[PDB]
């Protein structure tokens, strides 16, 4: 009985492969050959944020692209001011182990989660001027990998167990669950329109979910190892995925297959974080070889290198405005990079 | 303007207060000691926690030294992703049942993965080999477990340096030292990093495991400091 099901699944997979091969008409690298190279990208560190006293796993930028919140294993959640280097808030966490944080689009709430298997939400705007846990979200079985505010009232959380959930803060109960993954759901990135989001798991595959209905639409099995980072292209019709192969790969939703690979021979370490520039021409990608890299998103030529971190680069962010690029690391230092002419 | 000056002054005052709090908490953070109690299945973790929803904490302090013991309870079996979270701890208390399938081989394959992880290679490991009595009656009962689950037990002799048992069975002490030697050969095969292993034989349920942990942590800290001063 199971043999028939396995044969059917195999022949659907073969049909999908044949359809993708037939749809494969040209190559983005071939098309982009006749375009002017980006050139040398010189960016120097403008600010160093040196308040944390333990390694940083997460940072996030505000919508205004001025405030950034950073989390560390020492049970602190410090909210910086990038321009003046001052610290605005410092929230002592109940659990020392937090692997993620998220700054709400409204600027009112901040999320945080980790090995406690719960997501804590702090409302920064209080009458007494003190930050306190507004809500505790429990129901995930494994650790909490990533959490992104889809709104001020609903947050998507990707947990260690093979399950993503869409919550509702005003009531605290899950609204929709996203089952179908096989391994740890390491990362998660929302679409620009908050209509879709991709989740990169540890089974070397990525899915595309729609929050309103709640089922996967497409799958992208291009990689060959754990997927640690994921990021939508600014168009909202493509995304890049970092894995432990040291290769970023640009996928396309409409084409439903890869576009072009960002591998390099000199790179052996795994990819930890991935982000795009505002225009989508650049592709910053933090590595485990202590150095962040800048790629030409259309030609896969290394434009520049963001060397300067003592330990591995765990988190990488590009401002919504697009000016600066913050890179946290495991040496407990945040650095705000920028370019000058 | 004057308003922006007032805003900047308020921001500097808030920064000063937050920095004061951070400095005050830094001493506590640097004073406390973090341990990750990582047992390979049901090997005595319950009784070890007795004598001293995702993760657990047991704040026990000994000789004005504060200790954190983290027990990973509700996490999945997939350990390769959240174990990088614990490369800043001082030591990894590892618990092995020395008695479904062969548990000792699973313990060894977890131990060498922990040893050879590129982020955990700077972290020391402390071994507790529980179920000493269980191994004792298993050996005395003529049960074919070790002599056929490890073919190399036949050509093994108890080392001449260590024999502290008062009246225990020589076969039992040979089994104990064989298991300890297996873990020690795993530990000593690779000297890639700057970490050490402290194997212990947890037999009595008395308040001696806490003393062993305290002495091991003292040794770990002393080695780390002497290495940082390039003396060791």
């Amino acid at each position: 009985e199971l043999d028939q099901l396995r044969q059917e699944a195999e022949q659907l997979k073969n049909q999908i492969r044949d359809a993708r091969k037939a749809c494969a008409d040209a190559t983005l690298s071939q098309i982009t050959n006749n375009i002017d190279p980006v050139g040398r990208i010189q960016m120097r560190t403008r600010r160093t944020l040196r308040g944390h006293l333990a390694k940083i796993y997460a940072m996030h930028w505000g919508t205004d692209s001025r405030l950034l919140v950073s989390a560390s294993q020492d049970g602190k959640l410090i909210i910086w001011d990038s321009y003046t280097t001052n610290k605005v808030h410092a929230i002592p966490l109940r659990s020392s182990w937090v692997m993620t944080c998220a700054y709400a689009p409204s600027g009112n709430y901040v999320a945080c989660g980790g090995l406690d298997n719960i997501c804590s939400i702090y409302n920064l705007k209080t009458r007494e001027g003190n930050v306190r846990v507004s809500r505790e979200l429990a129901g995930h079985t494994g650790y909490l990998s990533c959490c992104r505010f889809l709104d001020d009232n609903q947050i998507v959380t990707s947990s260690g167990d093979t399950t993503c959930a869409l919550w509702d803060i005003e009531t605290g109960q899950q609204t929709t669950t996203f089952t179908g993954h096989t391994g740890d759901v390491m990362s998660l990135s929302l679409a620009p329109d908050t209509r879709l989001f991709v989740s990169g798991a540890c089974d070397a595959s990525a899915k595309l979910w729609d929050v309103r209905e709640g089922m996967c639409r497409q799958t992208f099995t291009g990689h060959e190892s754990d997927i640690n980072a994921i990021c939508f292209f600014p168009n909202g019709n493509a995304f890049a995925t970092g894995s432990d192969d040291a290769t970023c790969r640009l996928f396309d939703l409409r084409a439903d297959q890869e576009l072009m690979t960002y591998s390099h021979d000199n790179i052996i370490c795994g990819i930890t974080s991935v982000s795009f520039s505002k225009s989508g021409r650049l592709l910053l990608a933090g590595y485990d070889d202590f150095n962040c890299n800048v790629w030409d998103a259309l030609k896969a030529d290394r434009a520049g290198v963001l060397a300067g971190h003592d330990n591995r680069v765990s988190c990488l962010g590009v401002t919504d405005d697009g000016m600066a690029v913050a890179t946290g690391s495991w040496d407990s230092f945040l650095k705000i990079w920028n370019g000058s002419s | 303007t004057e308003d922006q000056r007032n805003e900047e002054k308020a921001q500097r005052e808030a920064n000063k207060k937050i920095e004061k709090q951070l400095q005050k908490d830094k001493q506590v953070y640097r004073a406390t000691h973090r341990l990750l109690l990582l047992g390979a299945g049901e090997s005595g973790k319950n009784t070890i926690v007795k004598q001293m929803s995702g993760i657990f904490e047991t704040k026990f302090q000994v000789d004005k030294v504060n200790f954190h013991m983290f027990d990973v309870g509700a996490q999945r079996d997939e350990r390769r992703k959240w174990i990088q979270c614990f490369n800043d701890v001082t030591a990894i208390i590892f618990v092995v049942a020395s008695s479904q399938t062969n548990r000792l081989q699973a313990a060894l394959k977890l131990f060498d993965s922990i040893w050879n992880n590129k982020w955990l290679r700077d972290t020391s490991v402390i071994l507790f080999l529980n179920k000493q009595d269980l191994l004792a009656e298993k050996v005395l009962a003529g049960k074919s477990k070790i002599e056929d689950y490890f073919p190399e037990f036949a050509r093994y002799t108890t080392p001449e340096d260590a024999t502290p048992e008062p009246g225990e069975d020589p076969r039992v002490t040979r089994a104990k030292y064989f298991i300890r030697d297996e873990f020690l050969r795993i530990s000593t095969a690779s000297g890639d990093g700057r970490h050490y292993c402290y194997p212990h034989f947890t037999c009595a349920v008395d308040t001696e495991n806490i003393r062993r942990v305290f002495n091991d942590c003292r040794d770990i800290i002393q080695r780390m400091h002497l290495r940082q001063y390039e003396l060791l």
Partner: nanobody
Amino acid sequence: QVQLQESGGGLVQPGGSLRLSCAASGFTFSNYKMNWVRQAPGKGLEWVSDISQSGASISYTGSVKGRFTISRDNAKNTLYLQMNSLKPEDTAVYYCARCPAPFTRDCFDVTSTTYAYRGQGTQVTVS
């Protein structure tokens, strides 16, 4: 994507011979440490063997040393297990797992109920 599919297996008298092969068609074979895993009908998963990136460091689970031989061929992207002198205790389901990351001598989660980079079953019985 990885698509690890194994061959061989079946019925054999005790003390007989059998050969198991592993087919990998989704990654670079020469970068990953490939290891075999077997699961008894009633017991849990049990690590049985392994082999290094090049084929230098080889280890066995005990009670199978000598009678089991593991070798890899990077040219054809195939992993082998030459297994000899079987006993009824060898009856199990054999899986061809793969360590999650390349160029690492350590790989954590191979003997787990829900691994992602291991193949399907390969029935082996002895009677």
